[PDB]
Amino acid sequence: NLDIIGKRIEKIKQEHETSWHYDQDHPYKTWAYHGSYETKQTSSMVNGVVRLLTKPWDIIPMVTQMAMTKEKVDTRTQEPKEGTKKLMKITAEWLWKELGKKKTPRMCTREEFTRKVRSNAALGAINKWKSAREAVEDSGFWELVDKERNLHLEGKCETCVYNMMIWYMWLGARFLEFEALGFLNEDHWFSRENSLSGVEGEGLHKLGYILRDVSKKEGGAMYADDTAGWDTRITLEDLKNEEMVTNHMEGEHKKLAEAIFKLTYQNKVVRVQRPTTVMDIISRRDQRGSGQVVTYGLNTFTNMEAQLIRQMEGEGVFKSIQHLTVTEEIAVKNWLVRVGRERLSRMAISGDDCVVKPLDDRFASALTALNDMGKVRKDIQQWEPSRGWNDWTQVPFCSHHFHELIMKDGRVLVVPCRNQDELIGRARISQGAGWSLRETACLGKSYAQMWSLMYFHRRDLRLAANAICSAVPSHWVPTSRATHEWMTTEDMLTVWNRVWIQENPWMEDKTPVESWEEIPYLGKREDQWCGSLIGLTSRATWAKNIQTAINQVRSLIGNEEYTDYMPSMKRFRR
Numbered sequence: 001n002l003d004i005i006g007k008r009i010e011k012i013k014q015e016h017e018t019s020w021h022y023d024q025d026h027p028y029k030t031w032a033y034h035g036s037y038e039t040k041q042t043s044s045m046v047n048g049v050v051r052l053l054t055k056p057w058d059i060i061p062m063v064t065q066m067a068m069t070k071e072k073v074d075t076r077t078q079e080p081k082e083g084t085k086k087l088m089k090i091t092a093e094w095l096w097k098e099l100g101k102k103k104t105p106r107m108c109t110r111e112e113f114t115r116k117v118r119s120n121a122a123l124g125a126i127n128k129w130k131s132a133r134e135a136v137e138d139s140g141f142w143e144l145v146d147k148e149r150n151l152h153l154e155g156k157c158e159t160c161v162y163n164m165m166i167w168y169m170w171l172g173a174r175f176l177e178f179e180a181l182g183f184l185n186e187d188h189w190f191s192r193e194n195s196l197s198g199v200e201g202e203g204l205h206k207l208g209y210i211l212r213d214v215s216k217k218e219g220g221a222m223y224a225d226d227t228a229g230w231d232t233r234i235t236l237e238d239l240k241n242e243e244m245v246t247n248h249m250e251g252e253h254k255k256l257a258e259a260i261f262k263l264t265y266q267n268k269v270v271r272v273q274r275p276t277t278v279m280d281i282i283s284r285r286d287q288r289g290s291g292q293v294v295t296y297g298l299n300t301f302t303n304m305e306a307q308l309i310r311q312m313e314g315e316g317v318f319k320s321i322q323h324l325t326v327t328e329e330i331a332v333k334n335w336l337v338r339v340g341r342e343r344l345s346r347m348a349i350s351g352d353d354c355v356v357k358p359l360d361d362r363f364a365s366a367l368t369a370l371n372d373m374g375k376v377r378k379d380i381q382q383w384e385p386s387r388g389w390n391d392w393t394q395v396p397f398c399s400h401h402f403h404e405l406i407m408k409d410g411r412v413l414v415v416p417c418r419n420q421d422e423l424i425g426r427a428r429i430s431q432g433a434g435w436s437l438r439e440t441a442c443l444g445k446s447y448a449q450m451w452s453l454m455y456f457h458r459r460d461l462r463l464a465a466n467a468i469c470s471a472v473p474s475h476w477v478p479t480s481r482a483t484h485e486w487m488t489t490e491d492m493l494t495v496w497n498r499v500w501i502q503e504n505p506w507m508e509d510k511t512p513v514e515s516w517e518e519i520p521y522l523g524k525r526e527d528q529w530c531g532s533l534i535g536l537t538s539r540a541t542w543a544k545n546i547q548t549a550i551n552q553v554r555s556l557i558g559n560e561e562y563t564d565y566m567p568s569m570k571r572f573r574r
C-alpha cells in the first residue's frame with residue numbers, strides 16, 4: 001500500500017504544501033483517497049474541407065450530432081474462485097511460452113523512443129519543456145529518467161503517476177514503460193503468424209479474409225460477445241498472470257519489467273480533477289491503467305486466455321470453477337498441449353474485441369468461468385446463452401463487417417464496411433486547435449485516400465474521395481495527429497493494386513488493374529442498406545454539380561496546382 005505508493009504521494013503533498021487537505025466529502029468508495037490540493041484548468045472541431053464536399057450530409061443527424069460535444073471506474077471486481085484462478089495461471093503460463101517460442105524479449109531504446117516522438121504518435125503523455133520532441137533533445141530529462149530508472153532497480157517509484165482526464169503520464173514514465181514492455185508491440189508478439197488468434201499489424205484489408213478463414217473450420221456459430229467496460233473488469237489476478245511475461249526475461253530487463261508491473265500496474269497513483277477544482281490523489285491496485293499500446297497487447301493476451309478457458313468449459317474439459325481436481329489440471333494441461341494452437345486459430349482477437357468459432361454451440365451457454373473472471377458480456381442477461389452468427393459476412397469485428405465482392409474478371413475481394421454515416425461523421429471531425437487551412441486540407445486528403453483504399457466499394461465514398469483529392473493541391477502530403485497505406489503521395493490506383501492484388505496472399509492471379517472502372521461496387525441495394533444516399537434527390541444534385549463544390553474549396557485554398565480525379569469515374573468520363 002503506502003509503502004509502494006507513499007514516496008509518490010509524499011512527493012506530491014510537498015509540491016502543494018500550501019493547499020493540502022484531507023477532504024471528507026470525497027466521492028470515492030472503491031478507490032483509496034489520500035488528499036486534495038488547489039488546481040484550476042480544463043472539444044472536437046469540424047474539418048471544413050470535408051464538410052464543404054459532403055453537403056447532403058449537413059441534414060443527416062447521425063452525421064451532424066457526432067461533432068457535438070463514469071460509474072464504471074468507481075467499481076470493484078470480486079476475486080475469482082480457486083478453480084478459476086488455477087485455470088487462468090495454467091493457461092497464462094502456457095500462452096506466454098507459446099508466444100515466446102519464436103520471439104526474444106528485449107529492451108526498447110531511447111533512440112527508438114526518440115524516433116517515435118518525431119514521427120508523432122499518441123503516447124498518452126502530459127514543466128521545464130513544452131512539446132514531447134523538445135524534451136527528448138534535452139539531456140536533463142534523460143537524467144530525470146536515470147533517477148527513476150535506478151529507483152525502479154531498488155524496487156521503488158517516485159514520479160510514475162497517472163493523470164485521469166484515458167490515463168496520461170509524464171513522458172519519462174512512458175519511456176520507462178516502453179523500455180520494459182515496448183517489445184510486445186515493436187516485435188509483433190500479437191501478429192497472426194506468432195499468436196494464431198491475434199491480428200496486430202494485419203490491416204483492415206486483411207481482417208475480412210481472416211474472418212473468412214476462421215469460417216472455413218468445422219464448428220458451430222461464430223460468437224462475438226463484447227465485454228462491458230473491459231479495462232474496469234481487469235482483476236489483480238489478471239495483472240499477475242500478465243506479469244508472468246517477466247519469467248521469459250533476464251538481467252536488467254527482467255528487473256525493469258518487474259518494477260513496471262509491481263510499481264505502476266499492480267499499485268497505481270492517479271491525479272483526478274473534481275469541480276467541487278481540487279486535484280484528488282487516489283490509488284487502487286486493479287483495473288487497466290497502462291499506455292494505450294501496452295494496454296492493447298495485455299488486453300489481447302488476457303482476452304486470448306479468457307476465450308480459451310470459455311472454449312475449455314464448452315468442451316467439458318472441467319466441470320466446476322470452485323475447485324480444480326489434480327486430474328482436471330492434468331486434462332487442462334493436456335488439452336493445451338494437444339489442441340491449444342488449433343483452438344487459438346479458431347479466434348480473431350484485437351484487444352477487448354473477439355470472434356470465436358468454437359468446436360460446437362455448447363460454447364453459447366458456457367458462462368461460469370467467463371462471468372467468474374469478471375468478463376461480463378455487454379447487453380445480455382448474465383446467464384442467458386450467447387447469440388451466435390451463422391454467416392461470417394454478418395459478424396461484427398473492430399467496428400466493421402465484411403462483404404464478399406466479385407470483380408468483373410472473377411477475382412474475389414473481401415472488403416471492410418461500416419454504416420456510411422459513421423465514416424462521413426468521423427472524417428468531418430478534426431482533433432485539437434491551431435490548424436492552418438493547409439493542415440485541415442491534408443487531414444481531409446488522409447480520409448479521402450483511406451476511403452479510396454478501404455471503402456472504394458461505397459458509391460458515395462468513392463465520389464467524395466475523388467472530389468476531396470481534386471479539391472486539395474495534388475502535391476500536398478496527407479497528415480494525421482491498422483497498416484496506413486493511404487498515408488502517401490503515391491498515385492492511389494498504384495497503392496490499390498499493391499494492397500488488393502500484389503501483396504494479397506488470398507489473390508492467386510496477380511494481373512494488375514489498369515483503371516478505377518475495373519474496381520467494383522457493392523450491389524445498389526447493399527450500398528443503401530449500409531447507409532448510401534443513392535436514389536435521393538439531394539445526392540443526385542451533389543453528384544451532378546460536384547465540380548462546383550470542388551471549385552468552391554479550390555477558391556478558398558487559392559492558386560495552387562490541382563488534378564481533376566472525377567473522370568476516373570464512368571459518369572464524369574464525358
Ligand SMILES: COc1ccc(C(=O)C2CCNCC2)cc1
Nearest residue numbers: 459524525528533534535536571
Ligand atoms: C451510381 O449508382 C447509382 C446511383 C443511383 C441509382 C438510383 O437512382 C437508385 C438505385 C436503387 N434503386 C432505385 C434507384 C442507381 C445507381
Ligand SMILES: [Cl-]
Nearest residue numbers: 389390391394
Ligand atoms: Cl447470421
Ligand SMILES: [Zn+2]
Nearest residue numbers: 157158159160
Ligand atoms: Zn516510477
Ligand SMILES: [Zn+2]
Nearest residue numbers: 401417418530
Ligand atoms: Zn456493409
